[PDB]
Amino acid sequence: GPLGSDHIWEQHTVTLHRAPGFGFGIAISGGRDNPHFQSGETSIVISDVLKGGPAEGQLQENDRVAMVNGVSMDNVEHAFAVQQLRKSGKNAKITIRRKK
DSSP: OOOOOOOOEEEEEEEEEOTTTSSSSSEEOOTTSSSSOOOOOEEEEEEEOOOSHHHHHTTTTEEEEEEETEOOOOOOOHHHHHHHHHHHHSSSSEEEEOOO
């Protein structure tokens, strides 16, 4: 979706049950306190996904993460964020939004 004269985004939260092989299912990417950042976003995003777990086809670059396990991901470092979902063990929910 390069352009649809709409640009409507929606927020959806899903619970990812940790499974053998990886767990989270997706790879965190971004961080507010990272080497490179952009003023006006500071939102974490998924770098890459294994495509073989609970988040195989749910969390991707197409969808920008806003909150994880209740914690906001629009002003935190990738480490602080990943450590939050990592604590789950078998119930890591992430809130993402997309428009296309």
